[PDB]
């Protein structure tokens, strides 16, 4: 949770979230008294960093748009 | 021609103080005539010379099955309404507590069910019995069933608060 | 009141108050007019303030 | 002024004459391609909880105690074609052979006939407040027989790419409703399948991310710098 | 360019009259002032009729076949409207106030309550052509004694019942044979008879009055006479009735009082199915759907609309206008919707399509002098009278900033950096420009300089420059940014209201006090070129002024003005009624458009009417206020000298006609002008108005489609270019294949360019084939995006309504199905076990 | 080259980011329909989330 309120940390904290989802059961992930304090705080720094790495797709089209720069060429 | 209606033996008593209420809606608004042999513990309507007797059979049947008075009439009018019938059938574990899961404490659940989708829900030992339109008829058996098959109680009660809503909803 | 109506709000204002106001955590459609459409569906309170 | 006058030629190919061009509603079946309706069909079918809690008033209406109980059952002879106004066409499931909705007969009959473009033409035709009714009761117990054939219908309904947003928001939809049935038995067999195909028709809408994706940053380039 | 027609008039979804719901109760017919508005609910967008009374309007019919539409004025001049056409058919006078307007059911008649008759005539055709008189009367009744409030005609088209001022409410037949059946009149009452009904089957007669009665009239005996067999009551104190409504196939009697509370009851039994307030003005305007499952309420004096769905207990919408009150406008960068500033202290985010509300804001505790928009489309600055510039999130809507100055000033004019670092803002009292930082919040300084209260503010969006514009005649450009701190005055002939700057940040154009818009070059700091403004000018002449038009000083000069996203168009406009768009390359006027020909409002007509003027005054200057019917409205709350105040009935006089802001718009072609009325909106629509681009005497439209059909894709597109019909650009746009989309889009010529990029803009938003736009705007970025890219201002409102259809309908597509892709995966991936 | 690498290391990690945002909320979902109350009066079940949503103070500026 608090590795990932950065944006230089988070992908550690992504990767270990995403082992204990799917190697956990999840019945006993939610009924854990203390597990949404924690997942109510780790949604919205996710949202966060979705948005910010699919900006980073959107913007890396600008290869894409050097690359038929560069074919139409001559 | 006649119909005949039994009556059970818990509903005999209620039927036979509350019979001058029944029996003008089945002799001057619609025009049959009534008879209730008390031998065979039926009730027999016959047409006279002056199809009325499937909708009185119908209101007598309600009466039967145990909705009150004014239920049943709102049965006998109100032709876009209808009734349905089913046994749990889906004993300590499946039976002893299923109809404890539907009514609740102090039927407080069956209460919720019955003001979310509009229906009227009497309840036996492990009959149910829904009287309604056609859409809350099958939003009350599908929340019934839900949790007769087992479902969080929250999950039943948000989906009766969605229901409500999107019942009484235009578009 | 009455009397920026009658001065024709040419005026001066009061100086400051630097008052305290709490904001639940609450989806901004509910936080909107009635009408078919939303502008925005993010959360009243940010990722550091939640 | 009034009515449009037909550019045909007098002395002493109809759309032409008459000066329009009503846009076909697709153009090759290889192409996705939107609904012909409004366009927050989709933000309001994903988020009619939230909109219809906006639109609440702030405080409870003073009504009356004696107020019928079927009150909207009662009216009169301008009709509502609303779903709570439904009425059945002509032993005990969740919808019976006398009790069936005309949604569950179709999606029952589509099942049968493994196609359920009727389906898709009656999902498409009603109403917001019908869609999510519909999606919200979906026999979610037993074999979960109608769940996978509403996943198979939105599987032959997105691989003819049509109205495409609304197969996708009737998927979020199902996803929302009872993917919790759906998480839970997972490994289930039926819904592995009708789940396993879904997503090998759904593979292939990469096509529009990286379309907008392409066309978002180079715009953005060209407009700024 | 320059044709631009009437669009839409966002804001004041509600002003005076009756509010109508079509026959499919899909839209509702609102009268704002003296235009009629149409809102589609369900396919969500609206519109607004070009017609236009000379006064408000106050009541309205359309007939069930939804075809044609009559409104009639506040003194009975009606309009009688084509319906799918928008154009009007026939204007008739009836000479008297007609308190209602209605059509028939079977649609063949309908009827009108002119003062104390009665008068029923029948309605044209719709596909019969013009003629001089096209109505025919039916009859004329005359049985009341007093005027007529209401209307109801039976389900079939066979009685009709009307209710008076005077006590009772009469039944009549439509003809003379029946004349037996409809003879009585329904007498008891203690005040207003405000409504009579029939119930479903026309048996009884329900008679609601003003007091709060409503009377049950059934056909009984004690023959049988119309008795009225039961009295139900409101009991209502201090609030009374204002307007009924019975749908009479669902039993439903729904009133609206004169304190908001609008009850609405089940009517042979009288129970109060709900009962709730619009707000604290009365409820002016109550109309039931066709099916009866929405109600919609109108409130005049805030100017409200209200539709409410009464099974579900939830608003359909809610919604609050603005009369006479709106110091700015701003359009969004992605020019889909209005932020209004207004004078009772709030900003609302219009959008424009739907003509609905989306959000308000009030943490202004007084009035909102200016908006702005920064950050591309994130935050919006507004700056106050209170003293405050206070910026304000888009994204979770709050006031996450507010700068004040040390001073206790109110700000008049505000202006954001493009990177929106700074926000400077200026007084009319201050002569100082106060320049705050946005992340700090604090006050960066204080520029001082001008001898004359700061008229308005620009940054250029390019160089980042300030042009700021003072009352002493003195434009002054102050380098703020990096070691200069360095400023140049421009003087000028008058005092400066109204600044613009060019959208590449070259130049800058002023309004001034003569009347003149005088273009600077900014880095040389020379005129380029004026216009004379002064005499294309449209200023009335008020009903208490005593000098006339031609003389009058007031408003010959234009105190807002905007440029064109190219940069070489002017739109301005000021406080008369006539808003000039200009070129400036030519310096001439392209087009002069009159605001409104309303007389309700003031400073309309040049010539004012000598019949009014008597030998003591004019005639519109008596208050005829103690005439009316009630005390709310015989009150005279309008203390003395006010101007520009608050709340319109503490003023006295007619509202004067005005324009406070002008825009145009980022996206297509439009301008919106925020008058009185509400904010105009004008664009031009290419349906209409063959205007070619080079042709010959061989392009014509069968000799596209030959092109076509015989598949030249090229030769077939650019002769859809050269007749510039858009039905040919579209078809030609749609048969073009797939795999010679970009060949065809490396090959259209250079001047085409625009032509098919703003195609492809107002196009993609609304059509449906998204793949196949997209695939369109590829090839084209990728063909010729360098010449887009060295053209910026060219393509700066056609390529910004490209990203209005990426980000608005293709992104958020995406977003759906990358949510429903990793639910997907997370629901097959995991282990729900117990 | 660049190009293929960098955009399969950009949705490589977008990809759990989205797997996790779905995840979790996932479980809040089915622990609040485990757990939470039970109102079907709206303006009971509004009042409740009212009461009961995250609060935060903040320093205004009249």
Sequence with gaps: RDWNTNAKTHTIAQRTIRCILMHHNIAKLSEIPGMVKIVDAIIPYTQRHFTRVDNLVEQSYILDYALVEMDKLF | ?171 | YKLDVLSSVHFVPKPASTSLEIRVETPTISMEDAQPLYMSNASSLAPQEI | QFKTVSTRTIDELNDIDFNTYTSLEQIDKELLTLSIGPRSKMNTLLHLDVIRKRSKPKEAPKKSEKLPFFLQLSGEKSVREGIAHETPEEFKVTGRLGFESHFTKQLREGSQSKDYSSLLATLINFSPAAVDLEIRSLNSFEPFDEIVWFIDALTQGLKSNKNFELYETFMSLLFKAHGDVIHANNKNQDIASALQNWEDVHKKEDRLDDLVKFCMGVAAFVTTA | KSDFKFSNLLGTVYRQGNITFSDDGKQLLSPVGNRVSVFDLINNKSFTFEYEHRKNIAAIDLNKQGTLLISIDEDGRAILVNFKARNVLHHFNFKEKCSAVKFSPDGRLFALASGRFLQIWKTPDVNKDRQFAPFVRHRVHAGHFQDITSLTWSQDSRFILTTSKDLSAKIWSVDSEEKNLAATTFNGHRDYVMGAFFSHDQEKIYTVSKDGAVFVWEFTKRKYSWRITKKHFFYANQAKVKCVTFHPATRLLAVGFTSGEFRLYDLPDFTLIQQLSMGQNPVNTVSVNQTGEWLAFGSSKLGQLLVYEWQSESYILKQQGHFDSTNSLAYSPDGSRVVTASEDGKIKVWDITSGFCLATFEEHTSSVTAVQFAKRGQVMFSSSLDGTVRAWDLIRYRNFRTFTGTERIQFNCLAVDPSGEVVCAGSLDNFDIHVWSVQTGQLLDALSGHEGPVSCLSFSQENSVLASASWDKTIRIWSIFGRSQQVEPIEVYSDVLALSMRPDGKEVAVSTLKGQISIFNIEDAKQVGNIDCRKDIISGRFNQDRFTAKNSERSKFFTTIHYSFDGMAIVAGGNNNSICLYDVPNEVLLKRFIVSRNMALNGTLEFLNSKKMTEAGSLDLIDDAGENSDLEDRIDNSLPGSQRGGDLSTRKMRPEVRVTSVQFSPTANAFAAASTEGLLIYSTNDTILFDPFDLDVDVTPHSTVEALREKQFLNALVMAFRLNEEYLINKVYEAIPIKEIPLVASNIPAIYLPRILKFIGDFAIESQHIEFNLIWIKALLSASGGYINEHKYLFSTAMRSIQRFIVRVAKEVVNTTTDNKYTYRFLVSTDGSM | RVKTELRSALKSTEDDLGFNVQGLKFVKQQWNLRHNYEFVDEYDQQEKESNSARKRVFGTVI
């Design chain 2, 1 to 171: 021609e006649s119909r005949k209606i039994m009556v059970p033996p818990h509903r005999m008593t209620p039927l036979r103080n509350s019979w001058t209420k029944i029996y003008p809606p089945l002799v001057e608004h619609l025009k049959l005539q009534v008879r209730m042999n008390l031998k065979t513990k039926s009730v027999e309507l016959r047409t006279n010379p002056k199809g009325a007797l499937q909708k009185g059979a119908d209101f007598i049947k309600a009466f039967t099955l145990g909705f009150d008075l004014d239920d049943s009439i709102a049965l006998l009018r109100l032709d876009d309404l209808y009734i349905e019938t089913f046994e749990v059938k889906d004993t300590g574990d499946h039976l002893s507590r299923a109809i404890g899961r539907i009514a609740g404490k102090d039927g407080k659940t069956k209460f919720a069910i019955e003001n979310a989708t509009r229906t009227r829900i009497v309840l036996a030992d492990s009959k149910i019995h829904i009287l309604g339109g056609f859409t809350h008829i099958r939003m009350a058996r599908e929340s019934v069933v839900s949790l007769i098959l087992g479902s969080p109680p929250g999950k039943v009660y948000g989906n009766l608060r969605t229901v409500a809503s999107r019942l009484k909803e235009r578009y």
